[PDB]
Design a protein around this ligand. Sequence first.
Ligand SMILES: CC(C)CCC[C@@H](C)[C@H]1CC[C@H]2[C@@H]3CC=C4C[C@@H](O)CC[C@]4(C)[C@H]3CC[C@]12C
Ligand SMILES: CC(C)CCC[C@@H](C)[C@H]1CC[C@H]2[C@@H]3CC=C4C[C@@H](O)CC[C@]4(C)[C@H]3CC[C@]12C
Ligand SMILES: CC(C)CCC[C@@H](C)[C@H]1CC[C@H]2[C@@H]3CC=C4C[C@@H](O)CC[C@]4(C)[C@H]3CC[C@]12C
Ligand SMILES: CC(C)CCC[C@@H](C)[C@H]1CC[C@H]2[C@@H]3CC=C4C[C@@H](O)CC[C@]4(C)[C@H]3CC[C@]12C
Lengths: 247, 247, 247, 247
Amino acid sequence: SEFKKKLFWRAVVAEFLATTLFVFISIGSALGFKYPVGNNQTAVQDNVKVSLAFGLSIATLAQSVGHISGAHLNPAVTLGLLLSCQISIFRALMYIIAQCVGAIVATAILSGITSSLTGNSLGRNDLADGVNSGQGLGIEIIGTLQLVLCVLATTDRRRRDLGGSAPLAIGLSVALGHLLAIDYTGCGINPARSFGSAVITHNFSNHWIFWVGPFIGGALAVLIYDFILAPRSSDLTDRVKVWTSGQ
Amino acid sequence: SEFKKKLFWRAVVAEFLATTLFVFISIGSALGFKYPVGNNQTAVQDNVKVSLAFGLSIATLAQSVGHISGAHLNPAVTLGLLLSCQISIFRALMYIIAQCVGAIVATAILSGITSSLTGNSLGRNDLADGVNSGQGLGIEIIGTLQLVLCVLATTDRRRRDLGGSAPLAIGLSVALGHLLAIDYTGCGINPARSFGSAVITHNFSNHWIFWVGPFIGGALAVLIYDFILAPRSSDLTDRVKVWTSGQ
Amino acid sequence: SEFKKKLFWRAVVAEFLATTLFVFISIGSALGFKYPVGNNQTAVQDNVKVSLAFGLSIATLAQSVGHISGAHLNPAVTLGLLLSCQISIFRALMYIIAQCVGAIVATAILSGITSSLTGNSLGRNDLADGVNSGQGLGIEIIGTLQLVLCVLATTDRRRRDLGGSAPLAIGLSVALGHLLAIDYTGCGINPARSFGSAVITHNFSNHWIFWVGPFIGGALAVLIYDFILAPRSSDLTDRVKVWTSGQ
Amino acid sequence: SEFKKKLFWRAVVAEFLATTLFVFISIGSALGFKYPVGNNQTAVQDNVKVSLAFGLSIATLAQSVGHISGAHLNPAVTLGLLLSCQISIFRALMYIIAQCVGAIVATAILSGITSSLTGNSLGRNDLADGVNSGQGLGIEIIGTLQLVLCVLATTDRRRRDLGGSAPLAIGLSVALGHLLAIDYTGCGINPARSFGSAVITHNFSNHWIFWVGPFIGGALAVLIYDFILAPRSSDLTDRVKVWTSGQ
Ligand SMILES: CC(C)CCC[C@@H](C)[C@H]1CC[C@H]2[C@@H]3CC=C4C[C@@H](O)CC[C@]4(C)[C@H]3CC[C@]12C
Ligand SMILES: CC(C)CCC[C@@H](C)[C@H]1CC[C@H]2[C@@H]3CC=C4C[C@@H](O)CC[C@]4(C)[C@H]3CC[C@]12C
Ligand SMILES: CC(C)CCC[C@@H](C)[C@H]1CC[C@H]2[C@@H]3CC=C4C[C@@H](O)CC[C@]4(C)[C@H]3CC[C@]12C
Ligand SMILES: CC(C)CCC[C@@H](C)[C@H]1CC[C@H]2[C@@H]3CC=C4C[C@@H](O)CC[C@]4(C)[C@H]3CC[C@]12C
């Protein structure tokens, strides 16, 4: 079905390109404070800068390509939309592949651009000292839960009260996730974004957190929105058809 | 009446869950600068980070659940809407109970997540040194007054000039309250948010400020908007019916 | 005419109250970094914090009272609207009186709240070292020019392309003015806001800058918008009638 | 054609004036942290402050003059719109001349205002230490690519899903570009803005980067949007007519 339609593959390519741009811009901002290189200074990360980088990247790329693909740019968001039966299983798989590959490409280009930084961590996500696996998992779950809940509400399509920029809302939710999580885990909140850094650095220590936590958060957001707060008056069996149809 | 309608209890549950998420995200951001734990650094709170955390949390959760409950997430806002006769007394009581319980639950989960921080104040609100009870009370009154005034104006329903995102407006008002009050009192501006920290820490010193000041601010905002700036052409006796009817 | 209409005086009172709230919130934010008092720390002003305080105060108060008065809260903006013949001379005079009195009241209340700060400058505007009168005047002129130009464009009423929140646009313009001018002059950009601090501190040194520069900026913005970029197809004599009529 | 129409020349003058204001405000913000002059302090640039200065300047000036000219204020954006055949070749040339001259005028006025700063670099763009020409070129290409892509999408005119403020979207994209690029290259992304500083300082070292990279980014954004993601159902030959007709 969608496999043979130009619009579907345009959406897949848009997801790939937008994820590449998002990862590159955001992680390049995160690495920015390490320059100048020679200057021996106790330069400290600016958390507001990084959070705004991620959030405004999401907002800008949503404004740019959401009408083409929905501007997921996040495997957790795609999983939320899959479980809320808004996209097909095939579209979800292709979107997640595109997001991961785009994150890998962005992080490789970034490692090329930032070659002067010694021991460049490439914005890899890991637990901060004093934060164990369960605590970082909880932080990741909550950040992804709020992001996916915002996405599910913003695109409900039963709503007539919405006003303003939906891309700005999603970008601000991403910025909020980062403001919460940068100090604890680096704020994965986006399994593809963490995967790119882990792959390029050849370091997967504690990496399962940044896949499991965001997916748990997305699943909980779907549960909360679709079955507790704003249920639909549609038989589940009918909604299941979207998985193999995309309609 | 509303006690037996599924929509009402969905709104109550939405208020509980959204208050939990808001408190957790915001206070976790506020505690973030204390990590890493072992690193002996004179790390200093970033006030813009915390203010944006609170404000963007409110904006995101409003976008997510406002159509379900109105997204009060603040006992002072609920009291403002009660005194402006927009909600019933029962809905106000249930909303405030839900907000307090959600704040308690969020702060307990956070105390679990941040166990590595010694003497974790859990973002408890107290007067800064050089600020006595009356001065902090004034700061709290003004912050809550502007927040409640913005909420009352944004939802006037007599207005045809409104544009953009109402959730963003309310979140930005919350961020403004924090930008004002973090240095003086920690910016309660939200009696449930202060109550959760006070309950979890078992410390209620100067806690009456963070209930009285926000309620005085809400009452003053109601007085200003409903009886000075934008009066309604409706007999007060009719508006009183909403308290026992919710209509 | 308007002298005997309840709506006009409601607008005047709204301008007074909103200017009071704006000045109090913003200058209280600006003074915040001096707390705690006893703590001997080389605490440094956060310019982003103060700029956002001013801008978001303007945005919130515009959302709250613009439909009641237009939410000028700035004598320079009122002068711009007077010279573009949108308000009457009487309304401009009453608005500017209300703005100045509200700024005075806010700064007095703030001086009460911040009594623990020794030598409290109360956010008074003055030239920074290395900035002479002409240079600060230029900074003030440009900041007020951009603010007044944004206000004139946002309320053109010939425009069908506008989208989003006009209050947010004006608040962001104010934030921009502060981001530019805080380091040079303290960013008056609002003669009433500077007047309140000057009156309460009993210090008027270089105060003429913060009245002249903003008025020059407003006049230049009116010239640019109304006579270079977006002229109206109306005889000037007809527009002059608004001064004595307000229509 | 347009050469003899008052609207076209009003648009050109608007581009000149708005570019002047944008450059002045933004670079004056960037130079702000060097004041006070006498105070010997290890004052450090605030990257969030500068990024917001640039972005909010673009947002405010877009709101003010976009309906008059489209508020390009950036030769790279004008080139993107030229290659997407939305403007004529003549309008593009006049706009770029106006933008460059406005940047020069703004930087000259700023050098006058900031005369107390010794060795005033006037916000000139150059490569940071550890960043060679190719790496800075890549940063510039990506920043301009995201900006131009956002502009092309926001003004597609085939879109019915857009909501909120387009000026705010473009300003936030500019802020994102700065958050990415300030630490690497000083954040050009606007060849006129870099040209003004280079001309006033009489320093053109590595200046070709800040013309080539932004134009490559704009060209790639046009390619991506117009030929990969959102193609138009119009013969290229017809679109070429706009270059000599502006229609
Ligand atoms: C979207 C694309 C076109 C933007 C980036 C393209 C160009 C400018 C970038 C991408 C990868 C970069 C290269 C990556 C790695 C290095 C190795 C280093 O020892 C010298 C510079 C060099 C050789 C870089 C030069 C600039 C470069 C070629
Ligand atoms: C919304 C929910 C599901 C997210 C948080 C859930 C999980 C990941 C969190 C919540 C409470 C957390 C626990 C709270 C307290 C402690 C005690 C400490 O000495 C070891 C870790 C441990 C045992 C935490 C592990 C992680 C934890 C179990
Ligand atoms: C909008 C209004 C109601 C909010 C502020 C009202 C109250 C809480 C404020 C306003 C002015 C304040 C007073 C101003 C000055 C001082 C003198 C100082 O040595 C002790 C505290 C004291 C006496 C303050 C106590 C608190 C105060 C009374
Ligand atoms: C848009 C315009 C009107 C705003 C700026 C205009 C005025 C206030 C500015 C622009 C250029 C400025 C001058 C530029 C250079 C210097 C040289 C210095 O040694 C003394 C101050 C002096 C002489 C400045 C005084 C103030 C000034 C005249």
